[PDB]
Design a protein around this ligand. Structure first.
Ligand SMILES: Nc1ncnc2c1ncn2[C@@H]1O[C@H](COP(=O)(O)OP(=O)(O)OP(=O)(O)O)[C@@H](O)[C@H]1O
Ligand SMILES: Cn1c(=O)c2c(ncn2C)n(C)c1=O
Ligand SMILES: [Ca+2]
Ligand SMILES: [Zn+2]
Lengths: 421, 58, 96
């Protein structure tokens, strides 16, 4: 029981815990700045720091392991639910493993074929009749014995090992567990080394809300961004073709013939010169190039000098920057739009904002004392514990509606006082 | 009118499931048609019961 | 942070490129110890405009030269073009 009680300590203290595993990951990277060169630590504040970085890298690694133990107890039964629900609904209603036989696309949808065979297939679904209903439903089109063939110390070889292999399968597809497994080994691979240990500053970005804002902003703004970066690679290359065919003798990195002068006009070392130097210059190309003195190409030299500048640096670099300045602009605008397209209209009655401010201070009363989506969750719990015999007129008209999957009974757009008075 | 329980009252205030409300709130006030929004709300309501059963094992 | 993550790269993998000497005349100074790489980067490499490729030596024919330009470009447009501009883009609106 103390093994169970300590495991129940971990799933309880999970969000408390990973908040601390960030704070340790600062304290290494606040201390890992104290190198000198073989690599060795100095000291300025405390006499001992080799003990601290030894004990903290052990203290970090177990706290990295106490999350993945805690996450396996806490959110894995949730993700074992929503997986197991969507199988048993689709096998009952349309019967995809009976009728549709799903194709090569959505492999994880076809992964759930090692679980329909097993015993404990409604393990956590509160509905243990998914095998008997489909044999009752589809025994007229298909053979019932075909369906039963399709469906169905002392404990080490008396447990359903075929269920656990499916149970292990649905775990490793989950992204949040995968990130914790990677965050575990990068504590362990940062125990061999210590500079491939500073990849625990990635926890700054990969929160939750700041993760799905980026994945929304990428799909909305990536295709424009790459193809404007991809435009920059072209117009630089079209200038490289000009300079290499027509201007090639101007590139020098010599001290006026002292060194056996280096060139940048071969095929590629013009282009890789341009995109490495001529972009970052600020003076275009006319800063790491010789001067047009009295040459017979001098008029065509300045045209190449100006129209490299304001076609690449003034214009094409700025509208690259003008995207990402707005692409971070949606990383604050999106999370604020959730917090203010929730306070305008209500969730379920969908009415709006002014219609319960016409009375003094009514929108909180219309929400938190009349519609209050948690109360609807407490209602659906209330029909569960209440016996079926005892339901009143409302609570059985609703409960038959909720069985047959309808949802006309929600107050769509016509809540109580909008028809009364 | 009905009866919200006692133990079911504190367990929705638990930060265990107060996170799972905040993830569900964020995913329907974004894109999603209202003809299936209440469809998604009940599919949230079915699993939110299942977090109450876990938090009772605490 | 992203300056520090570039400091970790240069100090472990690129450390011999930093010089402030007149070609061995002075007993050449380094910027790759633990912190004097980082305090070099945030004092010089931010304010440069050419990223880091202005107060650094040239990749001539070295066997790290292909990995040198990648460190040369992606220091620039991840810190100067992008990360410095959206800092400026806030205060231009915060005075707004
Ligand atoms: N149908 C609804 N039911 C409940 N709340 C609603 C509804 N429609 C809009 N809201 C708004 O959702 C808000 C939720 O409350 P609030 O965000 O202030 O506290 P919280 O939910 O504990 O915070 P968090 O959202 O960070 O969990 C309420 O202020 C309410 O105005
Ligand atoms: C047994 N049971 C149900 O039958 C049920 C339910 N939610 C909906 N139904 C229909 N829950 C949570 C439940 O435990
Ligand atoms: Ca009755
Ligand atoms: Zn409402």
């Amino acid at each position: 029981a103390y093994q169970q009680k300590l495991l129940n300590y971990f799933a309880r203290n999970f969000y408390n815990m990973r908040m601390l595993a960030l704070f340790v990951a600062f304290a290494i990277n606040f201390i890992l700045l104290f190198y000198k060169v073989v690599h060795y630590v100095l000291e300025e504040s405390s006499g001992y720091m080799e003990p601290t970085l030894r004990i903290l890298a052990i203290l970090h690694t177990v706290i990295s392991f106490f999350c993945i133990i805690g996450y396996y107890c806490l959110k894995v039964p949730l993700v074992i639910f929503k997986r197991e629900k969507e199988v048993a609904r689709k096998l009952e209603f349309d019967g995809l493993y009976i009728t549709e036989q799903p194709s090569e696309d959505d492999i994880k949808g076809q992964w759930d074929r090692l679980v329909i065979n097993t015993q404990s297939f409604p393990n956590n679904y509160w509905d243990k009749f998914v095998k008997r209903k489909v044999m009752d439903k589809y025994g007229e089109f298909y053979g019932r014995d075909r369906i039963s063939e399709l469906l169905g110390s002392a404990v080490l070889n008396s447990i359903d090992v075929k269920y656990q292999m499916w149970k292990l399968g649905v775990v490793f597809t989950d992204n949040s567990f995968l990130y914790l497994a990677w965050y575990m080994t990068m504590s362990v691979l940062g125990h061999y080394n210590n500079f491939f240990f500073a990849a625990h500053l990635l926890d700054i970005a990969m929160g939750f809300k700041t993760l799905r804002t980026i994945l929304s902003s990428v799909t909305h703004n990536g295709k424009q961004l790459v193809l404007t970066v991809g435009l920059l690679a072209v117009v630089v290359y079209l200038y490289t073709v000009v300079a290499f065919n027509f201007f090639r003798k101007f590139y020098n990195k010599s001290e006026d013939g002292d060194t056996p002068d280096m060139k940048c006009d071969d095929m590629l070392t013009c282009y890789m010169f341009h995109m490495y130097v001529g972009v970052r210059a600020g003076g275009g190309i006319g800063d790491e190039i010789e001067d047009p003195a009295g040459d017979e190409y001098e008029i065509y030299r300045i045209i190449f000098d100006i129209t490299f500048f304001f076609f690449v640096i003034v214009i094409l670099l700025a509208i690259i920057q003008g995207l990402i300045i707005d692409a971070f602009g949606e990383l604050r605008d999106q999370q604020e739009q959730v917090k203010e397209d929730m306070e305008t209209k209500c969730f379920i009655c969908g009415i709006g904002n002014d219609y319960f401010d016409t009375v003094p201070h009514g929108f909180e009363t219309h929400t938190l004392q009349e519609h209050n989506l948690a109360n609807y969750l407490f209602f659906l719990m209330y029909l569960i514990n209440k016996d079926e015999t005892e339901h009143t007129g409302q609570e059985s008209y609703v409960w038959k509606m909720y069985q047959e999957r309808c949802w006309e009974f929600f107050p769509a757009g016509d809540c109580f006082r909008k028809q009364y008075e | 009118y009905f009866e919200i329980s006692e133990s079911s009252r504190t367990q929705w205030e638990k930060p265990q499931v107060k996170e799972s409300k905040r993830q569900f709130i964020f995913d329907v006030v974004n894109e999603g048609g209202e003809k299936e929004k209440m469809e998604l709300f009940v599919n949230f309501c079915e699993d939110t019961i299942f977090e109450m059963q876990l938090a009772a094992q605490i």
